[PDB]
Amino acid sequence: RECISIHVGQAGVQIGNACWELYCLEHGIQPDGQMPSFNTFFSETGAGKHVPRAVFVDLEPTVIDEVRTGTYRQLFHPEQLITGKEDAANNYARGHYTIGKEIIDLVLDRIRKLADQCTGLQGFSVFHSFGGGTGSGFTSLLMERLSVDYGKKSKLEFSIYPAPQVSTAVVEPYNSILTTHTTLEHSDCAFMVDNEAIYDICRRNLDIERPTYTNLNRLIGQIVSSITASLRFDGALNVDLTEFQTNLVPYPRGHFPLATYAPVISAEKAYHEQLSVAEITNACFEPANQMVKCDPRHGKYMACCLLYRGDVVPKDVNAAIATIKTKRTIQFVDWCPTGFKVGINYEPPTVVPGGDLAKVQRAVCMLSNTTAIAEAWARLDHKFDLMYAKRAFVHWYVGEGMEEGEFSEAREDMAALEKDYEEVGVDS
Amino acid sequence: REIVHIQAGQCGNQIGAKFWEVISDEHGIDPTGSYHGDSDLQLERINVYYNEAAGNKYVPRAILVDLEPGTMDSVRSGPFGQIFRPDNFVFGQSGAGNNWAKGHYTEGAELVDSVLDVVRKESESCDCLQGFQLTHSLGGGTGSGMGTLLISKIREEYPDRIMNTFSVVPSPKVSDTVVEPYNATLSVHQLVENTDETYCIDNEALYDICFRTLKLTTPTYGDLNHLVSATMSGVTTCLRFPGQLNADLRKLAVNMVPFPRLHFFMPGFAPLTSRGSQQYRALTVPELTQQMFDAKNMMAACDPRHGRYLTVAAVFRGRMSMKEVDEQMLNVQNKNSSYFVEWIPNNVKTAVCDIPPRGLKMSATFIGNSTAIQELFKRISEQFTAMFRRKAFLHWYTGEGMDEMEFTEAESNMNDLVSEYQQYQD
Amino acid sequence: NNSNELDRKRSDAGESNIQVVVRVRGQAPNEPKRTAPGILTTSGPRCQQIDVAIEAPQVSSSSAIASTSNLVQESATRQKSYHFDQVFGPEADQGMVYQDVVGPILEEVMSGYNCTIFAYGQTGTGKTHTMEGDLTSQMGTYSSEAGIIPRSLYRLFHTLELSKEDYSVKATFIELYNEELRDLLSIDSSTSSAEPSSSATATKEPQHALRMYDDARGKGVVIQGLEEVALKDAAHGLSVLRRGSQKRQIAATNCNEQSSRSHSVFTMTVFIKDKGSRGEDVLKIGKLNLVDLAGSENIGRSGAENKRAREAGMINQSLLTLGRVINALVEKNSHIPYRESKLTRLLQESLGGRTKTCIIATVSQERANIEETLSTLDYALRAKSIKNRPELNTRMT
Numbered sequence A: 001r002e003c004i005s006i007h008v009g010q011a012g013v014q015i016g017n018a019c020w021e022l023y024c025l026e027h028g029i030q031p032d033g034q035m036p037s038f039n040t041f042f043s044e045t046g047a048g049k050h051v052p053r054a055v056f057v058d059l060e061p062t063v064i065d066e067v068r069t070g071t072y073r074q075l076f077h078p079e080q081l082i083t084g085k086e087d088a089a090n091n092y093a094r095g096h097y098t099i100g101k102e103i104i105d106l107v108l109d110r111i112r113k114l115a116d117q118c119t120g121l122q123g124f125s126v127f128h129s130f131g132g133g134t135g136s137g138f139t140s141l142l143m144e145r146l147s148v149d150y151g152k153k154s155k156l157e158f159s160i161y162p163a164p165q166v167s168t169a170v171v172e173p174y175n176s177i178l179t180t181h182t183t184l185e186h187s188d189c190a191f192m193v194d195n196e197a198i199y200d201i202c203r204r205n206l207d208i209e210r211p212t213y214t215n216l217n218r219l220i221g222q223i224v225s226s227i228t229a230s231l232r233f234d235g236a237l238n239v240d241l242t243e244f245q246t247n248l249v250p251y252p253r254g255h256f257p258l259a260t261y262a263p264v265i266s267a268e269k270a271y272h273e274q275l276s277v278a279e280i281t282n283a284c285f286e287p288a289n290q291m292v293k294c295d296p297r298h299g300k301y302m303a304c305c306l307l308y309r310g311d312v313v314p315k316d317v318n319a320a321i322a323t324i325k326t327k328r329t330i331q332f333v334d335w336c337p338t339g340f341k342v343g344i345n346y347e348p349p350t351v352v353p354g355g356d357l358a359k360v361q362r363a364v365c366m367l368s369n370t371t372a373i374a375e376a377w378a379r380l381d382h383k384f385d386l387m388y389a390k391r392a393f394v395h396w397y398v399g400e401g402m403e404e405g406e407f408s409e410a411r412e413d414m415a416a417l418e419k420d421y422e423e424v425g426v427d428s
Numbered sequence B: 001r002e003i004v005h006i007q008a009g010q011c012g013n014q015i016g017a018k019f020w021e022v023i024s025d026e027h028g029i030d031p032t033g034s035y036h037g038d039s040d041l042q043l044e045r046i047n048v049y050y051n052e053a054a055g056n057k058y059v060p061r062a063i064l065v066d067l068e069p070g071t072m073d074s075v076r077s078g079p080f081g082q083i084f085r086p087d088n089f090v091f092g093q094s095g096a097g098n099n100w101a102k103g104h105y106t107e108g109a110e111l112v113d114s115v116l117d118v119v120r121k122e123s124e125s126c127d128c129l130q131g132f133q134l135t136h137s138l139g140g141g142t143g144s145g146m147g148t149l150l151i152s153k154i155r156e157e158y159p160d161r162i163m164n165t166f167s168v169v170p171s172p173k174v175s176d177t178v179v180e181p182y183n184a185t186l187s188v189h190q191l192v193e194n195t196d197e198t199y200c201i202d203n204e205a206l207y208d209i210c211f212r213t214l215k216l217t218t219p220t221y222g223d224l225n226h227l228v229s230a231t232m233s234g235v236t237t238c239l240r241f242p243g244q245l246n247a248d249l250r251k252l253a254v255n256m257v258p259f260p261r262l263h264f265f266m267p268g269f270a271p272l273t274s275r276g277s278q279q280y281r282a283l284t285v286p287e288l289t290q291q292m293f294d295a296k297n298m299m300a301a302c303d304p305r306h307g308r309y310l311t312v313a314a315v316f317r318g319r320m321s322m323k324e325v326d327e328q329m330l331n332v333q334n335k336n337s338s339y340f341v342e343w344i345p346n347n348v349k350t351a352v353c354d355i356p357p358r359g360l361k362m363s364a365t366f367i368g369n370s371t372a373i374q375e376l377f378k379r380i381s382e383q384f385t386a387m388f389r390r391k392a393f394l395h396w397y398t399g400e401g402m403d404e405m406e407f408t409e410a411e412s413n414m415n416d417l418v419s420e421y422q423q424y425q426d
Numbered sequence C: 001n002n003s004n005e006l007d008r009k010r011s012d013a014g015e016s017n018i019q020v021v022v023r024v025r026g027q028a029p030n031e032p033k034r035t036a037p038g039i040l041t042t043s044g045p046r047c048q049q050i051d052v053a054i055e056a057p058q059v060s061s062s063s064a065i066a067s068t069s070n071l072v073q074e075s076a077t078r079q080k081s082y083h084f085d086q087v088f089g090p091e092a093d094q095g096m097v098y099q100d101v102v103g104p105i106l107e108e109v110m111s112g113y114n115c116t117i118f119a120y121g122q123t124g125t126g127k128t129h130t131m132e133g134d135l136t137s138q139m140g141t142y143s144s145e146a147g148i149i150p151r152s153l154y155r156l157f158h159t160l161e162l163s164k165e166d167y168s169v170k171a172t173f174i175e176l177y178n179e180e181l182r183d184l185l186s187i188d189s190s191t192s193s194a195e196p197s198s199s200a201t202a203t204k205e206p207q208h209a210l211r212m213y214d215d216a217r218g219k220g221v222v223i224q225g226l227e228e229v230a231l232k233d234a235a236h237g238l239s240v241l242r243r244g245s246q247k248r249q250i251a252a253t254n255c256n257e258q259s260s261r262s263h264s265v266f267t268m269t270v271f272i273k274d275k276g277s278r279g280e281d282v283l284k285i286g287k288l289n290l291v292d293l294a295g296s297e298n299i300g301r302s303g304a305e306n307k308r309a310r311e312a313g314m315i316n317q318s319l320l321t322l323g324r325v326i327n328a329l330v331e332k333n334s335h336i337p338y339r340e341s342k343l344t345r346l347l348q349e350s351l352g353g354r355t356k357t358c359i360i361a362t363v364s365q366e367r368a369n370i371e372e373t374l375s376t377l378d379y380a381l382r383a384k385s386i387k388n389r390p391e392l393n394t395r396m397t
């Protein structure tokens, strides 16, 4: 009944710095391990000074030396503090094959140190990127090996997705095409998070034009604390991750949900507002709070899972269930009859010390499905197609053995995958 | 993880001499050998340039190559020369005549193994080799001759390391020699096929930059190079120091090089302003991106607005905010989309370091690649054709005896070199 | 009295462009042991036909909820029908590919036509076997039927002796190992494991003029310095070419241990002289640049080591820069960048140059190696529109 974290790449390591800070805030945990009364991400020492069940992967020495010399360094154990010699330097080819074969036998060894400790392991999550070569290559190697090692667990991926307008490196579409096709081959569930619409939340819900990668991920980190950390706790109708396998995803490969978070309240907006149930349920169906550049009106709704926080009465929700069914402009699918899975737990979300959001009595992490992402799938693909036409930036990965037959493979079957979102509302 | 430095030439030895003056200022460094910094990042990532033994000294990873005594004598006689140790100064007592056909060919050959062993003295003692930094000339012979012969050997020693060099483009405006279009054109024959990259810095713009855009009086070699020395140190900051978007030099080698022959680049410094203009200016993210578009702040004498940008690196220094950073970068992309290339959608690569250099609170480093950097080549190549018709002063090199089959081919190198920007220019 | 007699203009830049030959992997002591039992036969997906020279691979077409590669087929069809000039298979013998490709060219290059032969395909496929081959089971192998080297060397003492003219056999073997140039026809006394003297005078020797000599008389023609031609009066002296084949760098990989690691440019020069009936001596010089290539190693599939990594990548970089020539030739771009790879500077002579050449497509037969063949079918489909202009060679008085 436990769960593991994995931090791959410069993106995925920095995600957990706010996530585990919230997880220390889940139980009042100081940098020693002080907590009363819980084992999901936790092993326990003799002193009761609990340790995370996390995996640190850095081919640089750089990013972990921020962590294991800064704060919260005593909670992480040098069992977990697994760094490397040299980065792939945004190379999918070196992150997968060349530099990836160097530290992989140490990290898999730490799994047998820790997955042996798990009393009935539920699964794990993987934190990585789509653009960085550590977060793309090492993800492509490890997830295939974990399918060999644990083919009967949960393979979650909370994967940052690049904007088709705001990008930081050139080969970011050139990375994720080769990455995700082998990821669709193996992974259980993969998310997409775009900082494009997170900036839209920073300016229209947070109303602040000055973000850091902390506050761009504390928003993401507050989701994951509501995704899984509440599932050990008991509310009205508690859910676990096994109630999403054939349930959330009605097919073997449709496993790409869309996560929203409705109450995003700057601290002054506690008084031009009076929160209720039906307000934030309507706030879940804004195209301006999708957290990814997408518009659900042009797509459909195959599923909609309402995962709640705090003081929630279901009879009040049954109004808000029946509300948006009546207030729809959604073009609901033909194949799902009505299935809108209800998740109501007890705990309100927690206030980040030094954060931006306000103390709300209730919070929704809504997982939905659409073909609006199938457009936003193809938008980064059109960035990828023009580089292959000129055959630019091609000498870095052929020199580590990545063939052009992969690019007719990975792109065209990703383009074939985008055609399979269209196959939702065809036969009726 | 460690970066090796080589210096050559009457300029590049002094250009490098100004550079470690900056790096000593970077970390709180005594000339004698004691630590006087206070930042932990000065102390935590020592190993990128530095070497340690016993003796309470600062002992360099600096191998310095010359054939003149009095150049590096005056380096040693001046300050930041006693910051070296005399286990490094490998040189000869023979005038090269400022000739490419001697330092590459005859007189440098008497000094090859006395340098490459000292390379092996360092590279075998290095923990993790990552950088082979070279600083030299392309106008004289010690910089051009002795520079190219090392790259024929160190790449043979290390085929899988990073070969960067800071090669000074000659200026048609201000010079004293005559055979200046020989030291460049013949160095091109080796810098293309054996270096992973090189920069293209010309004094011809630098006389305009310090005088006009910085409001100074006389462009001095102590300050024309001081402008270069800050842009030298700005390259590998995210390698050295922590950043949100830590970009490797190999990442900089990946994303700025779509084709492995177009590895010619141009630096750019973002607060290029005078002294009195501080009280007439606030310093912002649009203020730093303002000089991305400026033609005069291009340190090579090239109009960026003539050609079109191939790739652009934005290397930032300071506590910034990304939505301000990314959108202002996006605003410039929306402003001058005609000055870019189409098949690269993300025309500008960002790179954010978390610490600005001291004295500044916001700083950045423009590193662009445009289709008008080829212009400085067409100055020297047509000169090189004019030197070939009369074969004027060929009686300094005919005794050396470098072939015409070399010299037709260095132009044939140059003809294929320039004209392929213009495939993808328009 | 008079009608119009309308006329049309011409283009003499050349229509004799290129030959594209597809001889693939096949008949071995080991390969039909495993391909035909268990998997479908000699062209399982591919459907070999030789007359129209068409071939069309597939995979199993099923309703995939994420549609895989090669699900482009229909109710009953063949797809990606890459027809070529002549496609050959396992039954193509050494004399058969001689009879169609090599032999009738070897009577056309006797008068001054020039050629360049190279192969292209996936690693471990038979690039070495097509070029080098092996001498057959004879008590005396009197230049027996083998790869394209000794069988043309059999023709070398045949048709230059059938001409009964003043000929001069000239052969120079140059390695291309990590884009360097190494002779193996040399004395190689520094190469072999020998003991230098106690007073060492030459422990290293840079001597060969290994630099390109651009003459710019025509365009594309390659000149190097200090080449060592081979003058043999019979086929017994061909064992020093076997010494070059012996000392050529090979690799022991998981994909293939018989795969050669490096590759070589081995030129031919049949310096044949005879006087014409006008009173004019005719320097008939044919050139047959017998260039073997190494394998496009899937380095993740072989699982190579660190010393094998920079070897396999630069082989892959050589084949990648080769493909950088192919798209530039067919789009007709102005400054085709030969100058990155020196092998492409060696391929200035026929890729965009003047004289003839051919391409060999030794590609794999396995079902897991079909999209690997597509990276070769990427450039084999592009291989046709390569502009050339052949010419003979003579001597003026």
Ligand SMILES: CC(=O)O[C@H]1C(=O)[C@@]2(C)[C@H]([C@H](OC(=O)c3ccccc3)[C@]3(O)C[C@H](OC(=O)[C@H](O)[C@@H](NC(=O)c4ccccc4)c4ccccc4)C(C)=C1C3(C)C)[C@]1(OC(C)=O)CO[C@@H]1C[C@@H]2O
Residues within 6 Å of the ligand: B021, B022, B025, B210, B214, B223, B224, B225, B226, B227, B228, B229, B230, B231, B233, B234, B271, B272, B273, B274, B275, B278, B357, B358, B359, B360, B363
């Ligand atoms: C009153 C005062 O202190 O003023 C500043 C200053 O205002 C200005 C004018 C400085 C000044 O620099 C110059 O005038 C200059 C001229 C030629 C070549 C190089 C510099 C300054 O010298 C430069 C210097 O800048 C730095 O210290 C940077 O960190 C810089 N460091 C050095 O160049 C340096 C070298 C040796 C010893 C001490 C400093 C740097 C920047 C990037 C990467 C590495 C280093 C400082 C504080 C100033 C003065 C003194 C006027 C400027 O330059 C730099 C490089 O910061 C010119 O454009 C900026 C704008 C600055 O505002």
Ligand SMILES: Nc1nc2c(ncn2[C@@H]2O[C@H](COP(=O)(O)OP(=O)(O)OP(=O)(O)O)[C@@H](O)[C@H]2O)c(=O)[nH]1
Residues within 6 Å of the ligand: A008, A009, A010, A011, A012, A014, A015, A087, A088, A089, A090, A091, A128, A129, A130, A131, A132, A133, A134, A135, A136, A160, A162, A167, A168, A169, A172, A195, A213, A214, A216, A217, B244, B245
């Ligand atoms: N939202 C968010 N995105 C990030 C963050 N850090 C990196 N990214 C994204 O990740 C991409 C690059 O991936 P990185 O994780 O930085 O690089 P990597 O995975 O370590 O692999 P390398 O490129 O070799 O360093 C960038 O384009 C960003 O879009 C972060 O802190 N927050």
Ligand SMILES: Nc1ncnc2c1ncn2[C@@H]1O[C@H](COP(=O)(O)OP(=O)(O)NP(=O)(O)O)[C@@H](O)[C@H]1O
Residues within 6 Å of the ligand: C023, C024, C025, C026, C027, C028, C089, C090, C122, C123, C124, C125, C126, C127, C128, C129, C130, C256, C257, C258, C259, C260, C261, C293, C294, C295
């Ligand atoms: N068409 C064919 N006819 C006969 N034998 C073949 C044929 N194709 C493959 N073989 C056999 O398959 C073996 C394996 O091929 P091999 O030459 O070792 O690899 P490769 O493709 O040449 N690699 P490389 O040497 O790196 O270029 C050869 O030695 C032949 O014995």
Ligand SMILES: Nc1nc2c(ncn2[C@@H]2O[C@H](COP(=O)(O)OP(=O)(O)O)[C@@H](O)[C@H]2O)c(=O)[nH]1
Residues within 6 Å of the ligand: B008, B009, B010, B011, B012, B014, B015, B097, B098, B099, B136, B137, B138, B139, B140, B141, B142, B143, B144, B168, B169, B170, B171, B174, B175, B203, B221, B222, B224, B225
């Ligand atoms: N910026 C700068 N350029 C210099 C300096 N000294 C020489 N140069 C330039 O260097 C070039 C000549 O090369 P040089 O290094 O002097 O000769 P070498 O020793 O034979 O390489 C010319 O373009 C000069 O303008 C100097 O101190 N500063």
Ligand SMILES: [Mg+2]
Residues within 6 Å of the ligand: A009, A010, A059, A087, A088, A089, A090, A132, A133, A134, A135
């Ligand atoms: Mg990384």
Ligand SMILES: [Mg+2]
Residues within 6 Å of the ligand: C125, C126, C127, C128, C129, C130, C131
């Ligand atoms: Mg073979």
